Amino acid sequence: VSKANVPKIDVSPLFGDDQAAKMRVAQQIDAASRDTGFFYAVNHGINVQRLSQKTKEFHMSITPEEKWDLAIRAYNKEHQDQVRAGYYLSIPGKKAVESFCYLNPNFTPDHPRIQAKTPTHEVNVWPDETKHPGFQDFAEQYYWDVFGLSSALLKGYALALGKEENFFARHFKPDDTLASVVLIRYPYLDPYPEAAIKTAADGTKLSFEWHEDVSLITVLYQSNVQNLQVETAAGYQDIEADDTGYLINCGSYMAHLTNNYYKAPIHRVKWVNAERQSLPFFVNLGYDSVIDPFDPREPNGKSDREPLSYGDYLQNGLVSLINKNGQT
Ligand SMILES: C[S@](=O)C[C@H](C(=O)O)N1C(=O)[C@@H](NC(=O)CCC[C@H](N)C(=O)O)[C@H]1S
Numbered sequence: 117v118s119k120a121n122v123p124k125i126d127v128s129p130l131f132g133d134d135q136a137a138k139m140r141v142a143q144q145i146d147a148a149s150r151d152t153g154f155f156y157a158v159n160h161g162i163n164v165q166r167l168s169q170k171t172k173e174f175h176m177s178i179t180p181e182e183k184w185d186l187a188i189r190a191y192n193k194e195h196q197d198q199v200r201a202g203y204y205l206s207i208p209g210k211k212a213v214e215s216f217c218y219l220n221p222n223f224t225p226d227h228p229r230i231q232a233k234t235p236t237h238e239v240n241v242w243p244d245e246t247k248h249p250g251f252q253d254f255a256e257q258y259y260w261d262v263f264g265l266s267s268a269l270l271k272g273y274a275l276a277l278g279k280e281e282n283f284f285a286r287h288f289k290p291d292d293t294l295a296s297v298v299l300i301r302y303p304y305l306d307p308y309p310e311a312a313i314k315t316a317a318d319g320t321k322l323s324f325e326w327h328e329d330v331s332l333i334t335v336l337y338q339s340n341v342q343n344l345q346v347e348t349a350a351g352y353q354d355i356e357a358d359d360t361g362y363l364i365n366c367g368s369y370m371a372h373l374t375n376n377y378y379k380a381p382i383h384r385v386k387w388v389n390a391e392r393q394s395l396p397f398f399v400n401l402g403y404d405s406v407i408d409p410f411d412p413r414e415p416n417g418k419s420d421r422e423p424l425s426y427g428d429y430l431q432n433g434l435v436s437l438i439n440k441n442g443q444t
């Protein structure tokens with residue numbers, strides 16, 4: 117299988133005030149977005165080793181009792197309000213992956229969207245502090261650290277598209293973003309259950325089938341175990357692992373907004389019998405954010421797509437994905 121072109125882009129100018137340097141970053145983002153659709157963000161400023169250590173400590177110490185107590189509705193009918201946030205359980209013998217999802221820490225019981233019980237907004241659930249000292253605080257701070265990186269990246273994408281740098285970022289705000297963190301555990305298992313292994317039409321053993329992301333962009337930390345593949349005209353290609361960088365790609369909202377100038381790349385997860393982490397941040401806008409679709413290939417910038425609200429986009433997409441590839 118050939119290796120995918122995934123360049124490493126030094127994104128540090130996007131945090132500063134050197135506008136020319138920022139355009140040179142934007143060109144690299146443009147190039148990667150028009151090629152395979154992936155790049156690694158390097159010099160991003162985030163302590164990923166500490167993220168992976170705190171995440172390991174949580175995954176390896178949470179107990180079965182705690183998983184039920186935090187479980188989303190799909191696993192625990194008592195928890196009707198938890199569609200998105202909480203624990204996603206494994207099924208020994210059938211489903212290997214397990215994960216924990218949390219949303220904007222500002223979605224508190226007094227937040228006006230929580231009061232209105234607006235879809236896709238939830239108050240996060242957390243384990244007991246004494247059993248997981250430091251974990252909630254760590255995870256909440258991680259949310260804001262990756263939010264800051266994501267805001268810088270959105271400035272780069274906006275420049276790359278010929279827009280002013282706050283074109284996306286002005287819709288990405290601490291008080292209302294629908295962005296989520298997922299702390300995914302892919303375990304080592306001996307024997308590994310065949311029912312937990314899917315098989316692609318080409319024969320490749322998979323843990324998660326082909327999909328486009330439900331996001332504006334995805335900002336991903338993973339361990340140094342190769343597993344991702346991207347579909348290109350060349351066929352599926354392997355994305356090399358880099359546990360020092362953030363793997364970045366566009367989701368299908370970006371594809372809508374840009375009339376597919378920046379495609380949401382189709383990708384999938386190969387089956388690997390290895391204990392590893394996958395820690396995506398899904399960059400979602402606010403529930404009522406609307407960006408007028410455009411097309412940077414057309415002289416007048418005009419597109420024949422209708423405007424779509426982020427909240428409608430997100431609620432439909434999350435359901436569709438579960439229907440396509442199954443409840444994670
Ligand atoms: C790089 S790979 O595609 C990332 C990863 C994986 O399996 O490692 N994936 C997931 O997990 C899949 N994504 C989802 O199921 C969407 C989760 C959305 C989330 N529960 C939310 O409420 O925001 C996909 S995006």
Ligand SMILES: [Fe+2]
Binds near residue numbers: 327328329383
């Ligand atoms: Fe994905």
